[PDB]
Design a protein around this nucleic acid. Structure first.
Lengths: 135, 53, 62, 147, 342, 179, 131, 37, 168, 178
RNA sequence: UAAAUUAAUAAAUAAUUAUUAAACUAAUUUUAUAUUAAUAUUAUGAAAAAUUUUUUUUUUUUUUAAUUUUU
């Protein structure tokens, strides 16, 4: 198939398993015209609500990117509202807020700030220190 | 053909235009008006002669 | 072809010989809607004839 | 290793409990996550990878007698150096050496050409033969997947 | 091999497809003066253009009443789309004054095809192929009104063609194209590529029916000199069109390979109607000696100036040879002086 | 023959230590490289770069429980008409719009009905009398069809709707030019 | 402003039935004659079913609608690869009329035969009965 | 000589070296009855 | 021609008023008067000189330039090259690939980032049973124990049949 | 935004405001357009600086809506101004088979044109509302109640149902129209 | 694109490719179809038995594209 040497072009992964039927409205079939093959029913699928335009298209009304980054941060933070805290947890919900507000991606880096401000963090023999106002 | 004069068609050339060489006078031109046989390089030989092999 | 895309004309006029284009009301030296390699008027190669050669009179003579 | 084409900046730490799952298949899903193919921003130059923590290796599965009749063969330079070793023979040495070998079969599949792409995705999997692993502080989220 | 064309065949290129410009009047020439010498807001034009082509298809089908309606609409959307007296809003009624006349309403016909002209002369430079389309409608609605005195407008319409229609530019590029074919016994249908002036120069095709609808007038009224006053003009109209297409045959047989001759053949060629009109004797090249190094034997100061300069001698090539070949040429610089001195 | 050695001699600047120096050995190289770019462009660049995209729109579909195997068949079922490079543009810049699609194909919404053929109006058969004044019955309806479709498109304030405010009067714009 | 023709006369059958009616989807089974393998239209049969041709850059709303227009509403002129299209779509009709035009003459002079098939087809397939 | 029974190698350690010479219509495409290490 | 301001400022021209190859001097008779009418702000610097460089050259309003060799080029092919300096802006030599169709990529809805759909999860369409661990309804009880009943009725039926049908 | 139901024209009306993008279909290509972009399309016969409007539009979208026109979207305005009419970079190719002694240098540079888009503006007319998991039009539209809610998938029956985080298992679907 | 072949009294053409030229009718779709002459060109090499896989050598650039499942 197409230069039989070997095929290393990235192949598509098989389709995830559909959700349980739980309805008996023919949620089983594939060669049935009452629905397409894809079965996406996620946590926040019912917020993507659609209105039938007159031309033939649909006007899907969905929540804004600055809202699902709010919904997620809510979910991610009240994992435990008084429970354990993970280094990976804080660093994630530190970005979900930074994504919540004006999500242009910083253009430079995410750690150049810390790397330069580790002299008021670290105590290093105050004769060789870094006080904002150098005496 | 343009729909009207307000909306003219642009000038974006093709090879059928942008590479052409000056019109050296054919024999019917120097027949119509012999004022264009200025120098001897104008009196080109028979058109049936196409060049050396 | 169309190599040498820059460096041909220095981007400036000459001292007192270069003229920009006024417009289509005035006439440049040499311009003529016919392809002429030896461009001549009745001053540089003045034909010695009674009339001036023309498409109307078959020959510039009586 | 900072080295543009690395991208340690959008990392997600997965966790693939290998218990009961087939070893030639846990090596497949974990590769789509280390090579970062599960990402819609995947461009082959960037090695945008997501660390996987495949705990509970010793509970892997191999359909049929494929624990007894599948060789990990490698031929060294010395003449008469051809080595043949079953899975039940490398599992004596180190159980993670059979999973790290089945990963090497999957990362190579798309990245054999260049050394920087052959090996770098391999350093993203942390093969732990049991529950214990020092990455409690990396919050390994248990990735959902059905073979 | 052949081609079935059973699939979609993309078009070929050809110089018959150049976007030929329109035709107008000269700058100051106004129509009523020439005659008596002898952004925008959105409007769905693309949709009304489909709405008038069904008039051109209808008025050409004999359904002259239905065409009137389709033309009515497109003539409404045009007096709003374009400003007053635009070259376009004047032209649509010329399809209306015809559609009127082909429905008995001649009274409105003349009221229409006369309204256009005040949009035309009052313009800057009107579309010349239109003022011959109006002056035709004005000449046809006078027939429908049965007024022989109102029939000497054809001959006045073509008076503008003969005057203001440079009949070269219709067939300027298409004139040499027969010199493009290089085969003589297969695909030799390219040596005879003929484009017809009726199909290519509308104003010429219009000007022909004028000089044929004007003949039938004088033929009907049993007029003798009137007929001849037209027929000779109808021939003189075409004869100066077939002339602008003539050309001699270049090579005849199959020239092989010289594909780079594709540059000398297809190019802007001075038409026969122009090569004489702008002849290099009647139309003299202006040559300013301020930019050249030559002038007739009396105008010797007016050359492109220079700097500190002294005429050494004439460059007689034998000045290089030994002194006995420069003992000749001794006085040839003296003698040449007073030949260029007056 | 003609080695194109004029063009391929300026390129000898961006080669390594040997092809840059010696004109001969540089041509055999630069004409071997240029002859394989054009060999890879017209032959193999598509089938590779065309699968890095069917992997990005797919991988962006697994985040919604679907996949390219199902998405491809249902972007067409709904007549959506999106190039497979466009679905990668959405999955990467407009992640919501993509998701919004992925909800549509999973929804049980009727796809748009196939375009209709040409229907003969009844008035084509309706026998016309011998009447010259009035127009044909079929044109008085087809023309109405054309002017409604003319006003439905856009919100052209036709001189703030100065043209006939209603349709039966727009079809009478031929009486506006009669005396 | 934008456009959507999808036909020569538009006149699109509107899809939305009524505020409560049933949706009436189109049968997704590809018309297989034998019915046992039980297929399903494949992303390029839907594209054929939906009025396009094989690829949607053909015989659909992707060509027959202009690419652009001037803001004032002025359309854009035709091109070589536009006239060559219109002539092709008129060829796909003249291929059909002249075809049906010769069948008419054959069936109006009673020249079309009565035994269905060739002399070499009936002598090949047994299911075409004897005459 | 007469080159018979080609062998199409797929990778290694996943082809078993008996399935290489498989995809040839023969008594192969079975399980090697007595393998040697 | 950005924002209705021509990116071209002046076309430099060199020519010979008398020498030869008149396709430039012929251009300055018919086309140039017309091309000047459309774009007057373009300042056509025509230079006469003995030994004329065959190259048209345009000077754009950012200092950039371009040349277009017109050696052996007919008059029609000079105007075409004339109209092609006013058109371009001389700002980028971009290959028309599928990556450079858009010169600026601005996503209005924010890009896809890992944390967007990360906390979603698969779900049903009409409420499911926690059919493992759910307090049954009094009707359910009667159903299953009728099914499970009808199952036990079958097993212990045929266990006996193996021994009794042996001496029935 | 046109609409019949007065409540819809009072809740969807603020959705279509703000910035807007559109994905037009010009020259057999597809461009994701927004009111400040330049996109190089295959050569259009539009003289530089002239205004222009794209007729084939496939999808419009904004910060919290996307109009999924199935084949195309009627009544959406996207207008651009032709900035440049230029030839792009040269894609030089060499076609010299090894057998024959001929080398064909075919150098083709693409003819594009840069359309700096002015604005996109959209005013759609809806018919009503239709729930996803039953593609029937709804009679009435309540701006808060989702027409079809969603519920968990873990029926407990499956011994190896892959558990995500505990929090991913239970999570509502927030109201967003207000 | 492999085709040609008769030593020797009155039997229509060797064949190839090539250069250069030539003519549409009893003979159907309203389909399809490289026939003729003149000249240039004759060395690309099978022995036995049996018998009355496949289309590729060659692409102007951008997209687009229907032949995949392990024991």
């Amino acid at each position: 198939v197409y230069s039989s040497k070997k095929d290393r072009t990235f192949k598509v992964m098989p389709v995830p398993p559909p959700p349980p039927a739980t309805t008996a409205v023919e949620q089983r079939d594939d060669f049935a015209d009452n629905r397409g093959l894809s079965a996406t029913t996620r946590t926040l699928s019912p917020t993507f609500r659609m209105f039938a335009l007159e031309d033939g298209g649909v006007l899907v009304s969905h929540p804004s990117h600055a809202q699902i980054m709010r919904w997620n941060q809510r979910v991610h933070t009240e994992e435990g509202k008084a429970a354990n805290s993970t280094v990976m947890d804080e660093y994630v919900n530190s970005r979900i807020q930074a994504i919540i507000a004006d999500n242009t991606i910083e253009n430079t880096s995410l750690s150049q700030w810390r790397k330069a401000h580790m002299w008021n963090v670290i105590k290093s023999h105050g004769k060789l220190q870094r006080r904002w106002g150098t005496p | 053909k343009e729909f009207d004069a307000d909306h003219p068609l642009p000038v974006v050339g093709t090879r059928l235009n942008e590479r052409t060489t000056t019109h050296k006078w054919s024999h019917w031109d120097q027949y119509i008006n012999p004022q264009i046989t200025q120098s001897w390089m104008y009196l080109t030989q028979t058109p049936e002669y196409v060049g050396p092999r | 072809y169309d190599s040498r895309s820059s460096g041909v004309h220095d981007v400036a006029p000459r001292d007192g010989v270069d003229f920009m284009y006024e417009g289509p009301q005035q006439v440049l030296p040499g311009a003529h809607p016919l392809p002429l390699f030896h461009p001549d008027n009745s001053v540089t190669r003045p034909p010695v004839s009674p009339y001036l050669p023309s498409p109307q009179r078959p020959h510039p003579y009586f | 290793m900072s080295k543009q084409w690395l991208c340690r900046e959008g990392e997600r730490w997965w966790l693939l409990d290998a218990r009961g799952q087939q070893l030639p298949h846990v090596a497949k899903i974990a590769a789509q996550y280390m090579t970062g193919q599960h990402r819609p921003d995947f461009t082959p130059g960037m090695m945008t990878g997501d660390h996987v923590v495949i705990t509970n290796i010793k509970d892997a599965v191999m359909t049929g007698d494929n624990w007894i009749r599948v060789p990990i063969t490698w031929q060294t330079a010395y003449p008469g150096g051809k080595y043949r070793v079953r899975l039940s023979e490398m599992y004596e040495r180190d159980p993670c050496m059979v999973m790290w070998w089945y990963l090497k079969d999957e990362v190579n599949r798309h990245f054999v050409r260049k050394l920087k792409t052959r090996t770098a995705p391999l350093e993203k999997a942390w093969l732990y033969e049991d529950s214990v692993h020092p990455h409690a502080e990396k919050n390994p989220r248990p990735l959902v997947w059905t073979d | 091999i052949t081609r079935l064309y059973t699939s979609y065949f993309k078009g070929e290129l050809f110089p018959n497809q150049l976007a030929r410009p329109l035709e107008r009047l000269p700058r100051g020439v106004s129509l009523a003066a020439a005659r008596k010498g002898q952004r925008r807001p959105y409007v769905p034009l693309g949709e009304v253009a489909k709405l008038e082509l069904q008039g051109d298809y209808l008025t050409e089908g004999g359904l002259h009443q239905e065409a009137l309606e389709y033309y009515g609409v497109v003539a409404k959307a045009y007096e709003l789309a374009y400003p007053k007296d635009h070259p376009q809003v004047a032209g649509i009624r010329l399809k209306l004054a015809g559609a009127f006349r082909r429905t008995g309403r001649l009274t409105s016909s003349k009221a229409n095809c006369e309204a256009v002209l005040q949009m035309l002369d009052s313009a800057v430079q009107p579309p010349l192929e239109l003022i011959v389309e109006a002056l035709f409608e004005l000449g046809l609605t006078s027939e429908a009104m049965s007024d022989a005195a109102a029939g000497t407008v054809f001959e006045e319409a073509v008076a503008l063609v003969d005057m203001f229609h440079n009949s070269g530019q219709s067939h300027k590029m298409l004139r040499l194209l027969p010199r493009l074919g290089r085969r003589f016994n297969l695909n030799f249908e390219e040596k005879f590529v003929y484009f017809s002036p009726f199909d290519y120069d509308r104003v010429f095709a219009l000007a022909d029916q004028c000089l044929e609808r004007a003949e039938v007038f004088y033929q009907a009224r049993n007029d003798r000199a009137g007929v001849m006053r037209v027929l000779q003009q109808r021939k003189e109209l075409i004869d100066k069109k077939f002339f602008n297409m003539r050309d001699f045959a270049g090579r005849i047989h199959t020239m092989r390979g010289h594909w780079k001759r594709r540059a000398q053949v297809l190019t802007n060629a001075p038409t026969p109607d122009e090569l004489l009109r702008y002849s290099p004797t009647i139309h003299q090249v202006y040559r300013d000696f301020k930019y050249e190094l030559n002038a007739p034997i009396g105008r010797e100061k007016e050359v492109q100036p220079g700097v500190n300069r002294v005429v050494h001698d004439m460059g007689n090539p034998y000045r290089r040879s030994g002194v006995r070949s420069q003992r000749m040429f001794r006085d040839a610089e003296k003698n040449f002086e007073k030949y260029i001195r007056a | 023959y003609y080695r194109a050695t004029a063009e391929l001699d300026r390129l000898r600047g961006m080669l390594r230590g040997r092809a840059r120096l010696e004109r001969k050995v540089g041509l055999k190289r630069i004409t071997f490289l240029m002859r394989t770019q054009t060999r890879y462009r017209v032959e193999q660049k598509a089938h590779w770069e065309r699968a890095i995209v069917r992997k990005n729109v797919d991988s962006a579909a697994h985040e919604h429980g679907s996949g390219w195997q199902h998405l491809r068949n249902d972007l067409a079922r709904q007549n959506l008409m999106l190039l497979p490079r466009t679905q990668q543009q959405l999955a990467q810049y407009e992640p919501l719009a993509f998701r919004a699609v992925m909800e549509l194909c999973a929804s049980r919404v009727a796809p748009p009905p196939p375009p209709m053929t040409a229907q003969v109006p009844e008035e084509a058969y309706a026998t016309r009398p011998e009447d010259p004044k009035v127009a044909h019955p079929a044109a008085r309806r087809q023309l109405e069809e054309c002017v409604e479709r003319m006003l439905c498109t856009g919100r052209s304030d036709v001189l703030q709707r100065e043209g006939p405010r209603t349709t039966q009067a727009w079809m009478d714009a031929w009486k506006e030019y009669d005396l | 402003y934008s456009e959507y023709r999808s036909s020569y006369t538009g006149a699109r059958s509107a899809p939305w039935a009524a505020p409560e009616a049933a949706p009436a989807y189109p049968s997704a089974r590809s018309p297989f004659p034998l019915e046992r393998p039980r297929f399903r239209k494949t992303h390029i049969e839907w594209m054929l079913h939906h009025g396009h041709g094989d690829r949607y850059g053909k015989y659909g709303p992707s060509r027959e609608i202009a690419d652009f227009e001037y803001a004032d509403g002025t359309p854009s002129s035709i091109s070589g690869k536009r006239f060559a299209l219109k002539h092709h779509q008129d060829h796909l009709l003249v291929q059909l009329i002249r075809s049906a035009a010769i069948v008419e003459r054959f069936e109006e002079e009673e020249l079309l035969p009565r035994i269905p098939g060739t002399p070499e087809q009936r002598s090949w397939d047994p299911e075409i009965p004897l005459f | 000589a007469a080159a018979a029974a080609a062998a199409a190698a797929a990778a290694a350690a996943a082809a078993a070296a008996a399935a290489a010479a498989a995809a040839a219509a023969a008594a192969a495409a079975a399980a090697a009855a007595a393998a040697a290490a | 021609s950005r924002n209705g301001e021509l990116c071209l400022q002046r076309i430099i021209v060199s020519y010979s008023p008398n020498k030869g190859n008149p396709a430039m001097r012929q251009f300055m008779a018919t086309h140039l008067p017309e091309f000047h009418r459309q774009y007057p702000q373009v300042k056509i610097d025509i230079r006469p000189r003995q030994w004329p460089e065959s190259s048209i050259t345009g000077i754009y309003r950012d200092g950039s330039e371009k040349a277009y060799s017109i050696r052996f080029l007919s008059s029609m092919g000079i105007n075409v090259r004339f109209h092609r300096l006013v058109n371009e802006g001389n700002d980028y030599n971009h290959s028309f690939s599928a990556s450079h169709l858009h010169l600026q990529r601005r996503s209005v809805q924010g890009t896809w980032n890992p944390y967007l759909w990360n906390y979603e999860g698969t779900r049903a369409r009409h409420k499911p049973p926690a059919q493992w661990s759910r307090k049954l309804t009094e009707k359910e009880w009667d159903y299953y124990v009728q099914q499970y009943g009808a199952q036990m009725k079958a097993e212990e039926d045929t266990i006996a049949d193996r021994v009794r049908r042996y001496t029935d | 935004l046109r609409s019949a139901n007065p409540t819809i024209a009072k809740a969807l009306q603020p959705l279509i405001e703000g910035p807007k993008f559109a994905v037009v279909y010009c020259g057999n290509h597809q461009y994701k357009v927004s009111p400040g972009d330049v996109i190089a399309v295959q050569r259009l016969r539009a003289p530089i600086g002239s205004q222009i409007a794209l007729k084939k539009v496939l999808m419009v979208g904004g910060p919290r809506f996307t109009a999924i026109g199935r084949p195309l979207l009627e009544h959406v305005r996207v207008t651009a101004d032709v900035e440049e009419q230029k030839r792009m970079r040269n894609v030089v190719s060499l076609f010299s088979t090894p057998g024959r002694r001929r080398l064909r240098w075919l150098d083709a540079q693409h003819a594009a044109t840069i359309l700096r888009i002015r604005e996109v503006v959209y005013e759609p007319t809806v018919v009503g509302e239709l729930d996803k998991y039953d593609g029937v039009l709804l009679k009435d539209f309540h701006a808060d109640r989702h027409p079809n809610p969603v519920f968990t998938a873990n029926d407990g029956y499956d011994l190896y149902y892959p558990k995500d985080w505990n929090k991913v298992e239970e999570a509502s679907a927030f109201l967003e129209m207000m």
